[PDB]
PDB file of C-alpha atoms in Angstrom:
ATOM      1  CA  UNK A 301     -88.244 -13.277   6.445  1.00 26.60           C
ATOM      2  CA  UNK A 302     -90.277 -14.398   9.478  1.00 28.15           C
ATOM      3  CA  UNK A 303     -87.880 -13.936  12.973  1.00 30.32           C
ATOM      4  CA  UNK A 304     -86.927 -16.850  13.703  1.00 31.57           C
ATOM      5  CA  UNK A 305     -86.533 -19.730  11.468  1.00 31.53           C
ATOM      6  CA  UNK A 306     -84.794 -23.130  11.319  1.00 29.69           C
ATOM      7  CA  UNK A 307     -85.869 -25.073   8.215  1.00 30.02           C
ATOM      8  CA  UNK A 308     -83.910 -24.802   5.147  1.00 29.89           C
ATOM      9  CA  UNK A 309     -84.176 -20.853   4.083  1.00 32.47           C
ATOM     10  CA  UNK A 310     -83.489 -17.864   5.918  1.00 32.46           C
ATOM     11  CA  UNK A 311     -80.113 -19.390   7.066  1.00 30.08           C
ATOM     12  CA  UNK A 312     -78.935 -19.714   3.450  1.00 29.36           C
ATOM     13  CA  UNK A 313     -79.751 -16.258   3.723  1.00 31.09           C
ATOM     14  CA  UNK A 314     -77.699 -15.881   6.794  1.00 31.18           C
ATOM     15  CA  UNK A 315     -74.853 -17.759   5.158  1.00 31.07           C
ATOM     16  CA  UNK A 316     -74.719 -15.205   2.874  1.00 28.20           C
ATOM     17  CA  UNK A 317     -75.327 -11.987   5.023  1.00 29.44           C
ATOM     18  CA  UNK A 318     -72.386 -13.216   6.878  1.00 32.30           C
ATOM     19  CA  UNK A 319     -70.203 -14.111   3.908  1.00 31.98           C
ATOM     20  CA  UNK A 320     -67.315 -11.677   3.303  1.00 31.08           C
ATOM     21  CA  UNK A 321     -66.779 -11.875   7.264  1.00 31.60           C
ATOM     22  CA  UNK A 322     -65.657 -14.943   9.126  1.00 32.94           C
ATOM     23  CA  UNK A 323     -65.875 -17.070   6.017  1.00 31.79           C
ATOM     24  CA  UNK A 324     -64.849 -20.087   7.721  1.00 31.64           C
ATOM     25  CA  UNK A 325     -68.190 -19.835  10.090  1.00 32.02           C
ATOM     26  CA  UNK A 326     -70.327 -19.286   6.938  1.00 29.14           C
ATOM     27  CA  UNK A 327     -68.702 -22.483   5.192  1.00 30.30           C
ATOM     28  CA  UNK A 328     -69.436 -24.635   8.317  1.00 29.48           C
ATOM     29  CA  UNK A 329     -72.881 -23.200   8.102  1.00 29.31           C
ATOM     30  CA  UNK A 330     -73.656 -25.167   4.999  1.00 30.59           C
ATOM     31  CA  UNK A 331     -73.504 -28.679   6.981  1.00 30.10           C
ATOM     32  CA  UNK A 332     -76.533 -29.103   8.671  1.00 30.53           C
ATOM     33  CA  UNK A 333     -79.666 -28.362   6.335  1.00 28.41           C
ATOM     34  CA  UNK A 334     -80.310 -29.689   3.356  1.00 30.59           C
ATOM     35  CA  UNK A 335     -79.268 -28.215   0.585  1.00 29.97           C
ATOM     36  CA  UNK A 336     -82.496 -28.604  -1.624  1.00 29.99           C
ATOM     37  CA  UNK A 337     -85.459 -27.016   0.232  1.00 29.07           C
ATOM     38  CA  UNK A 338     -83.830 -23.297   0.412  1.00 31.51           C
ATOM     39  CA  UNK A 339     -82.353 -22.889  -2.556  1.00 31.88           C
ATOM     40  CA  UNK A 340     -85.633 -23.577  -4.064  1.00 30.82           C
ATOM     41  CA  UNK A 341     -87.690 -21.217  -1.679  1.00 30.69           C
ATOM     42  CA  UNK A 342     -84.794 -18.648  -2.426  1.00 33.16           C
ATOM     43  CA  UNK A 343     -85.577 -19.312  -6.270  1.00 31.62           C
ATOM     44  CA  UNK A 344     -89.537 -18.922  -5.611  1.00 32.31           C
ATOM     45  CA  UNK A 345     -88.902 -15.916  -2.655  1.00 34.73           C
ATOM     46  CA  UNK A 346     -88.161 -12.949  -5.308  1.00 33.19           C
ATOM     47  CA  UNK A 347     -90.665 -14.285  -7.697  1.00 30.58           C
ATOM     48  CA  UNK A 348     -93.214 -12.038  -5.743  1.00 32.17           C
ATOM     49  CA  UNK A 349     -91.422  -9.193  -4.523  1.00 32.21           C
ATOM     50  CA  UNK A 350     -91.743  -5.324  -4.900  1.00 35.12           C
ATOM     51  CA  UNK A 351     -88.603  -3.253  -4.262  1.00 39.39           C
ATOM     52  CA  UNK A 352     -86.002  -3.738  -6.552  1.00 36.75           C
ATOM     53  CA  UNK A 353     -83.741  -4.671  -3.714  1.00 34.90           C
ATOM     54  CA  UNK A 354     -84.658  -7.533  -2.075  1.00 34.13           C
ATOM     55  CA  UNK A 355     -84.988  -9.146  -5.323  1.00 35.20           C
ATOM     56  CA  UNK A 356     -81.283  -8.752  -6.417  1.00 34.64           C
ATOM     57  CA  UNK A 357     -80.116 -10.286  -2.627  1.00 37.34           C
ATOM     58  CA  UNK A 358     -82.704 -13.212  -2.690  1.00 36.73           C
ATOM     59  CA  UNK A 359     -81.105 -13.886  -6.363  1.00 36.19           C
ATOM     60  CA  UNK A 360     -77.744 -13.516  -4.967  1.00 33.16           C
ATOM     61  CA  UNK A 361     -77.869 -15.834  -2.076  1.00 33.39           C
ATOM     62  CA  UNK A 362     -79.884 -18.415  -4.284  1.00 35.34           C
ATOM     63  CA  UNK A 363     -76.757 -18.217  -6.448  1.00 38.93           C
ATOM     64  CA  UNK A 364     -74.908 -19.345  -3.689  1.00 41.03           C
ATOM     65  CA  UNK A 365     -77.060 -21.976  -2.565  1.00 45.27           C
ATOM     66  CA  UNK A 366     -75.553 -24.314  -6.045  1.00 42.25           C
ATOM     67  CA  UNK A 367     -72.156 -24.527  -6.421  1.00 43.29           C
ATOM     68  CA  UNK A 368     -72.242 -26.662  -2.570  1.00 41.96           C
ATOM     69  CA  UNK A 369     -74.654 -28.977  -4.288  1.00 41.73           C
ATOM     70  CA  UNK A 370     -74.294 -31.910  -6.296  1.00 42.35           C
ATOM     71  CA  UNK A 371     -72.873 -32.496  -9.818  1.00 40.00           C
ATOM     72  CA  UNK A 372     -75.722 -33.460 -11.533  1.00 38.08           C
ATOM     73  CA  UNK A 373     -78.869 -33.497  -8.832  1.00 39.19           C
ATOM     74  CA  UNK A 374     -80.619 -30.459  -9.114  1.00 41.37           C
ATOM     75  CA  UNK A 375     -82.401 -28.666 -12.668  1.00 42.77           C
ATOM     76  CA  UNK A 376     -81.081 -25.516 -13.420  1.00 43.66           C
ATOM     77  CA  UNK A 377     -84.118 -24.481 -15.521  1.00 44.84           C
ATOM     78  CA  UNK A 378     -85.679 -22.843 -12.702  1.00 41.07           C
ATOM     79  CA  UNK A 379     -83.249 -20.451 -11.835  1.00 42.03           C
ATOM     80  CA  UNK A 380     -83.656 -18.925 -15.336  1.00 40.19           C
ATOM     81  CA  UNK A 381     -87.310 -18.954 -15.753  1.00 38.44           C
ATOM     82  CA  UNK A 382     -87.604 -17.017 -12.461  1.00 38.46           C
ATOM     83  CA  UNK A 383     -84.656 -14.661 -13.581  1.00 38.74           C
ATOM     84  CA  UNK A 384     -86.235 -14.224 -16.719  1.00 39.45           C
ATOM     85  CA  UNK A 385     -89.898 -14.183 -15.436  1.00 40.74           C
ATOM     86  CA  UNK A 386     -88.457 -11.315 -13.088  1.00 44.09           C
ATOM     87  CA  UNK A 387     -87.695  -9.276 -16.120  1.00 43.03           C
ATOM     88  CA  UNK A 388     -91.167  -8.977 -17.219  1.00 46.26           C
ATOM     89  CA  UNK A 389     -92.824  -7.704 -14.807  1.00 48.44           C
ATOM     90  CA  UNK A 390     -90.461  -4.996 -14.041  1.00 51.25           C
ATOM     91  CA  UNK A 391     -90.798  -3.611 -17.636  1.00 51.64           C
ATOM     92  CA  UNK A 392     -94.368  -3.473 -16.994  1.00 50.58           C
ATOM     93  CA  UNK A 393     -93.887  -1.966 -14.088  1.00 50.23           C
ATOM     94  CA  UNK A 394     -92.379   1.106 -15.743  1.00 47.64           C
ATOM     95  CA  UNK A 395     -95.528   2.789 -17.982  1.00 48.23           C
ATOM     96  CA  UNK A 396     -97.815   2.576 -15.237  1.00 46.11           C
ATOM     97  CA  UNK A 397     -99.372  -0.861 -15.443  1.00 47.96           C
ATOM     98  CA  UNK A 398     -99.173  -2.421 -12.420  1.00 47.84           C
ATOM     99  CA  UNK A 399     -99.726  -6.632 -12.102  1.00 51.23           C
TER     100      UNK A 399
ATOM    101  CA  UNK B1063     -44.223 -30.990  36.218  1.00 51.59           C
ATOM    102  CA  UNK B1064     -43.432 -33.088  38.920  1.00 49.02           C
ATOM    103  CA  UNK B1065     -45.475 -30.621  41.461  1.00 52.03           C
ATOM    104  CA  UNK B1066     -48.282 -31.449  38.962  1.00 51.30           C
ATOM    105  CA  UNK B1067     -47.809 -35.312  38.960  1.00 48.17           C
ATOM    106  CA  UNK B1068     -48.712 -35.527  42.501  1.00 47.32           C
ATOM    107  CA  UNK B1071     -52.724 -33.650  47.697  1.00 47.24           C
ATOM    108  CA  UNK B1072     -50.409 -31.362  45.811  1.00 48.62           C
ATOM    109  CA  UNK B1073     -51.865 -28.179  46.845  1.00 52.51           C
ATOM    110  CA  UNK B1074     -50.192 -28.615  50.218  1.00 52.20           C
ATOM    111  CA  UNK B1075     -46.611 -29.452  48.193  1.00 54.99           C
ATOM    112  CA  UNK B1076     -47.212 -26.658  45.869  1.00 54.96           C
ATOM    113  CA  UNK B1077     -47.599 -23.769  49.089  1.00 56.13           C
ATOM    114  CA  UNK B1078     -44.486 -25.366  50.042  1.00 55.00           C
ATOM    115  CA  UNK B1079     -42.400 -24.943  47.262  1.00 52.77           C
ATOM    116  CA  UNK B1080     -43.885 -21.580  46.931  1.00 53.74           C
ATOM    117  CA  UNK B1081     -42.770 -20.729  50.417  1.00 55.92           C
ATOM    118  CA  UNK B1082     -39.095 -22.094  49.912  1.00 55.35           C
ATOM    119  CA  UNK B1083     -39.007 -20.132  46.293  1.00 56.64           C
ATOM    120  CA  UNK B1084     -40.225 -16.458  48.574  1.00 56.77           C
ATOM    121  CA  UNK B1085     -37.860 -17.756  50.965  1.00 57.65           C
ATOM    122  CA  UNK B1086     -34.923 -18.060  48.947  1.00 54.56           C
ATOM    123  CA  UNK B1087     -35.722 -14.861  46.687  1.00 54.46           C
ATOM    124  CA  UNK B1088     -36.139 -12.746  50.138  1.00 55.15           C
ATOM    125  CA  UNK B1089     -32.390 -14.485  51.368  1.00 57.36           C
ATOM    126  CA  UNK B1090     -30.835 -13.924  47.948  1.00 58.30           C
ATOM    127  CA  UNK B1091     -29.594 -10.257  47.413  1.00 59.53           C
ATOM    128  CA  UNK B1092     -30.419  -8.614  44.095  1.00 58.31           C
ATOM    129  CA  UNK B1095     -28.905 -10.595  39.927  1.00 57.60           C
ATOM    130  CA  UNK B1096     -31.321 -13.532  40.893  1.00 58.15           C
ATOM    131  CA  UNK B1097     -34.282 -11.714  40.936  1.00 56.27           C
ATOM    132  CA  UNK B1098     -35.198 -12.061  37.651  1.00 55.95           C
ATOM    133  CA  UNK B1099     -34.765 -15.871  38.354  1.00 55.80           C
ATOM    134  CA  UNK B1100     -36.974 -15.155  41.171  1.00 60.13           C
ATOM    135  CA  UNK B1101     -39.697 -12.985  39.119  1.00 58.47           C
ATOM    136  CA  UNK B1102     -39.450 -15.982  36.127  1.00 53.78           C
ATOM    137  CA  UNK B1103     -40.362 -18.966  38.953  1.00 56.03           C
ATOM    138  CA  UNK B1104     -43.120 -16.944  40.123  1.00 55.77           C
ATOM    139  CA  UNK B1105     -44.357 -16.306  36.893  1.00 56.66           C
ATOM    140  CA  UNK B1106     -44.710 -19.669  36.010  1.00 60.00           C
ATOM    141  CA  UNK B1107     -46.101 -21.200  39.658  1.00 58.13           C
ATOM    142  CA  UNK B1108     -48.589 -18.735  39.038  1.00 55.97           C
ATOM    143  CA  UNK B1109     -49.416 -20.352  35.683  1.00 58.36           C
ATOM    144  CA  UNK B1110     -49.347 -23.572  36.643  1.00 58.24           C
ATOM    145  CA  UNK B1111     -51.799 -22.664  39.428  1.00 60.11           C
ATOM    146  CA  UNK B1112     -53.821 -21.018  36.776  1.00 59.53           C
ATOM    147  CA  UNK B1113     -53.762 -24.523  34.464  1.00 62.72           C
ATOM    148  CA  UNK B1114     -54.150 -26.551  37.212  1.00 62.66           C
ATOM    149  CA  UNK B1115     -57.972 -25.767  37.130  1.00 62.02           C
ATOM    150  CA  UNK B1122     -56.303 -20.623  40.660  1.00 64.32           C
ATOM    151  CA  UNK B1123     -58.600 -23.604  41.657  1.00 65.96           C
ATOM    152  CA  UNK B1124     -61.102 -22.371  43.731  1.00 70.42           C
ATOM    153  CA  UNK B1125     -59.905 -23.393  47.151  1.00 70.68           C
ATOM    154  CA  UNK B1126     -56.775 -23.873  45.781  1.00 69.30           C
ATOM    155  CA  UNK B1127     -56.563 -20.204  45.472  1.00 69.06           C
ATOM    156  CA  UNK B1128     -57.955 -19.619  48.961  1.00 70.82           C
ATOM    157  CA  UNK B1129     -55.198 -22.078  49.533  1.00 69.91           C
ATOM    158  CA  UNK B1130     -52.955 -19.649  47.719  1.00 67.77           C
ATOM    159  CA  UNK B1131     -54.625 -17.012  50.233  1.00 68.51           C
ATOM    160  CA  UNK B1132     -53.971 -19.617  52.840  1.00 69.58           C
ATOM    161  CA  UNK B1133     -50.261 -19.207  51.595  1.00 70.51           C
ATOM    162  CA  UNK B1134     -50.565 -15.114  52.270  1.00 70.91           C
ATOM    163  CA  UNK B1135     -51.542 -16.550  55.895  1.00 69.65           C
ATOM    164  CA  UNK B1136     -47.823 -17.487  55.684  1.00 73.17           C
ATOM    165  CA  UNK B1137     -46.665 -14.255  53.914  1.00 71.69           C
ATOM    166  CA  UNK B1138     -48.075 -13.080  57.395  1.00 74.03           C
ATOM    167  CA  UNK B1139     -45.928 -15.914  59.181  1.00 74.44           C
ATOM    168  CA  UNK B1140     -42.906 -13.573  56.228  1.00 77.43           C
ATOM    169  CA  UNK B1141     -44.339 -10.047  57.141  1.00 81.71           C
ATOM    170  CA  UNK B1142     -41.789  -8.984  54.681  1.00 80.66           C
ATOM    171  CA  UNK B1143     -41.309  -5.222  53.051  1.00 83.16           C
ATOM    172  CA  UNK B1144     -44.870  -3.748  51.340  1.00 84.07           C
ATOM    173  CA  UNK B1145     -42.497  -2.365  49.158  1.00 81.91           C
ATOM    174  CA  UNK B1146     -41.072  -5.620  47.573  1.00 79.17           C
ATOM    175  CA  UNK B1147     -44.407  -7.300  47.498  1.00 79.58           C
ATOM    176  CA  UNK B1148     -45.833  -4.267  45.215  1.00 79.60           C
ATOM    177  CA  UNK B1149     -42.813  -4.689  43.028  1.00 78.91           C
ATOM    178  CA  UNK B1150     -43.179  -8.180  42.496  1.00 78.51           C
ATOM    179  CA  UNK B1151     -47.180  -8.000  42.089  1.00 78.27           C
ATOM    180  CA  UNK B1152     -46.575  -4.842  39.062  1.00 81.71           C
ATOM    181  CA  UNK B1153     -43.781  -6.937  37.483  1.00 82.37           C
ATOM    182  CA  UNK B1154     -46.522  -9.930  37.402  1.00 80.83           C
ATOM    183  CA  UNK B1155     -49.056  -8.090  36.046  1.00 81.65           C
ATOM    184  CA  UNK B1156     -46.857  -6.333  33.734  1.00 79.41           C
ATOM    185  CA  UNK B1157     -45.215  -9.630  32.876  1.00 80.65           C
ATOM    186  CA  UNK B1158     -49.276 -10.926  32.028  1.00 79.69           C
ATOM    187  CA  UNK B1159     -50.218  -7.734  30.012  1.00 83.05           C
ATOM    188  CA  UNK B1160     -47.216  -8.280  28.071  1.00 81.82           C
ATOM    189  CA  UNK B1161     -47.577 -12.191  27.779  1.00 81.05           C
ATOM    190  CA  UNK B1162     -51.412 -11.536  26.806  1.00 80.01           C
ATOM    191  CA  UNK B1163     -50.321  -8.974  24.130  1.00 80.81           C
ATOM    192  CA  UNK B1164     -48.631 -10.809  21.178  1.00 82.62           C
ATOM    193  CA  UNK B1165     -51.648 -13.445  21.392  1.00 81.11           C
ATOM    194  CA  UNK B1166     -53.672 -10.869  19.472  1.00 82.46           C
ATOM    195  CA  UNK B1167     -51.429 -10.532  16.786  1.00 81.43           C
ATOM    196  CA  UNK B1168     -50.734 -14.291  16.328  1.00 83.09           C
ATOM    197  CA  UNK B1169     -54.926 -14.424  16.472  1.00 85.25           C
ATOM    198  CA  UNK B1170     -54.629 -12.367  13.933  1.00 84.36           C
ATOM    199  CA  UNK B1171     -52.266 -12.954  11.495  1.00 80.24           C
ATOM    200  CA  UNK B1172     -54.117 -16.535  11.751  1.00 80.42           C
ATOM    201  CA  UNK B1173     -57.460 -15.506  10.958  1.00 78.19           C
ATOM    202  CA  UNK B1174     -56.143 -13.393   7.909  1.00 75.33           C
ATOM    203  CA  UNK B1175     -54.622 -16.390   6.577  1.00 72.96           C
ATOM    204  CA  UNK B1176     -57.646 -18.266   7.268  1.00 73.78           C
ATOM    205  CA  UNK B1177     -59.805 -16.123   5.602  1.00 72.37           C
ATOM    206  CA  UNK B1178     -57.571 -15.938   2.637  1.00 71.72           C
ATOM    207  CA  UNK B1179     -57.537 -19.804   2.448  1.00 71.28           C
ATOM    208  CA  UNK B1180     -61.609 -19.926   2.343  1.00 69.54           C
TER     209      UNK B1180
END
């Protein structure tokens, strides 16, 4: 979220804000950072947040941030311990316990 | 071609002077002939790059529209029918633009 970036992350992010729109642009995107650093900050981004909106688009664009990977390079365990870990702490967040 | 094979900018007011000559000669049925040569000088000054000088050079040649001095008239005509002629030419490149990037998009 900080303006201006250029490591891995918040261009995965842009990839994805600008998907739906000049898809050929947001395919080249995916070409010149790594594929391995941002999708894991993307995983471990919503982890933390607040609003139940951000969460939902940092999920989304960590989706797609696997299907341009490898086969068989990257674990896919922490994708759902951070979607399930998610789940949690909005339920608490519902009687009035806040954490 | 050939005026593009070759100093040419002298070669190419030339034959830009014989083609005004021979339009202003002509009575009007060539004049479309006329428009279409003019059309297409203009673009190959355009691709040779206007060119700068060249273009002053082209100026140079309205030194010899001077040395012409023919009807204001005519020279109007001939300078709406261009543009016209570039509007229109300009105009259908949108659509092809288009109808590419739709396809494009449906592709990704």
């Amino acid at each position: 979220f900080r303006i201006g970036s250029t490591e891995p992350g918040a261009m995965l992010v842009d990839s994805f804000s600008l998907l739906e729109d000049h898809a050929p642009k947001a395919i080249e995107i995916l070409k010149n950072f790594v594929l391995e650093k941002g999708v894991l900050d993307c995983i471990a981004a919503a982890i933390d947040e607040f609003e139940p909106k951000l969460q939902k688009m940092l999920l989304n664009a960590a989706s797609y941030g696997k299907a341009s990977l490898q086969y068989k390079s990257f674990d896919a365990s922490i994708f759902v311990n951070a979607c399930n870990t998610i789940k949690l702490l909005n339920c608490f967040r519902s009687f009035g316990i806040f954490l | 071609d050939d005026c593009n094979s070759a100093e040419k900018k002298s070669c190419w007011i030339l034959l830009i002077t014989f083609l005004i000559t021979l339009y202003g000669k002509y009575p009007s049925e060539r004049k479309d002939l006329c428009n279409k040569l003019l059309q297409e000088a203009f673009l190959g000054l355009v691709r040779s790059k206007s060119g700068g000088e060249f273009w002053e050079i082209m100026s140079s040649v309205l030194e010899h529209q001077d040395v012409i001095l023919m009807k204001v008239q005519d020279l109007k005509q001939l300078l709406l029918n261009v543009f016209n002629t570039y509007k229109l030419e300009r105009s259908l490149s949108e659509l092809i633009q288009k109808i590419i990037e739709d396809s494009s998009q449906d592709l990704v």
